[PDB]
Design a protein around this ligand. Structure first.
Ligand SMILES: Nc1nc(Nc2ccc(S(N)(=O)=O)cc2)nn1C(=O)c1c(F)cccc1F
Length: 259
């Protein structure tokens, strides 16, 4: 079905732990895509074989304009290859480094797109649990696309930087869909401020800040944004709103966009 000889490899798009993502073109069709090349050796050492299977499993079956498509996979003596949809406008992570922070209109638009993709996800009992600017890509029309379903499981189940994880997850407790709603609040804050609300110079300190829900808003954050973020950043998961409530929030409806 799939072999490396079917693709013309180009520019690297990302580099990491387990391997790199390259721009590639399918020889037969001239289809431009992104090839994630992971190394078996590293995947074995970390014991992430289950997570990679779940990524493949989940992303090949999901169909949504705000969720990155996985077209297929293959492997060789030492590498596993994922055939991904290529997002041309890069990561939201990179966009935020370049603009420093986003205006309300851009933020509300991204939050709408994310919430729609998460409603679709949750309606198939899939919980992402790893929403962060590095896992959010931008399509050709600048539309947000969720990318790495590796840490996603079927709710209610039971690590790098803690910045986007909720208290129930960092404490090792039982968690469900509401975990993605906390992540949304962290992202909405970071989009407007330029830094996540529980950021610190150490993991130990970030853990304290998250478990204690210790965030303060700078002067430029409007009351509407402060209301949505405060509602999302609740210690009690049941106290967090539903995704419908988020899409209908007056700050969202007043600043977002529609097709
Ligand atoms: N599938 C996907 N497409 C892209 N697009 C892309 C386009 C431009 C740039 S940039 N501004 O040049 O550095 C970067 C990426 N990334 N990609 C990925 O899986 C991917 C990811 F999720 C996270 C990190 C890196 C990736 F590579």
């Amino acid at each position: 079905q799939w072999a490396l000889e079917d693709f013309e490899i180009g520019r690297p798009l990302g580099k990491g732990k387990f391997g790199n993502v390259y721009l590639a073109r399918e020889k037969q069709s001239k289809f431009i895509l992104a090839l994630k090349v992971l190394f078996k050796a590293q995947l074995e050492k970390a014991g992430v074989e289950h997570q990679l299977r779940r990524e493949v499993e989940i992303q090949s079956h999901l169909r949504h304009p705000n969720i990155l498509r996985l077209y297929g996979y293959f492997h060789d003596a030492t590498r596993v290859y994922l055939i991904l949809e290529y997002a041309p406008l890069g990561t939201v992570y990179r966009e935020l480094q370049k603009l420093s922070k986003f205006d309300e209109q851009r933020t509300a638009t991204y939050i709408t797109e994310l919430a729609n993709a998460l409603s679709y996800c949750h309606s198939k009992r899939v919980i992402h649990r790893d929403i962060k600017p590095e896992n959010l890509l931008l399509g050709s029309a600048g539309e947000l696309k969720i990318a790495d379903f590796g840490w996603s499981v079927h709710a209610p189940s039971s690590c790098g930087t803690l910045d986007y994880l909720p208290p129930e997850m960092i404490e090792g407790r039982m968690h469900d869909e509401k975990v993605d709603l906390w992540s949304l609040g962290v992202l909405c804050y970071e989009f407007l401020v330029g830094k996540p609300p529980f950021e610190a110079n150490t993991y130990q300190e970030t853990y304290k800040r998250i478990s204690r829900v210790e965030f303060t808003f700078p002067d430029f954050v409007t009351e509407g944004a402060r209301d949505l973020i405060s509602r999302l950043l609740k210690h009690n998961p049941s106290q967090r709103p539903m995704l419908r409530e988020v899409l209908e929030h007056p700050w969202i409806t007043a600043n977002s966009s529609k097709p």
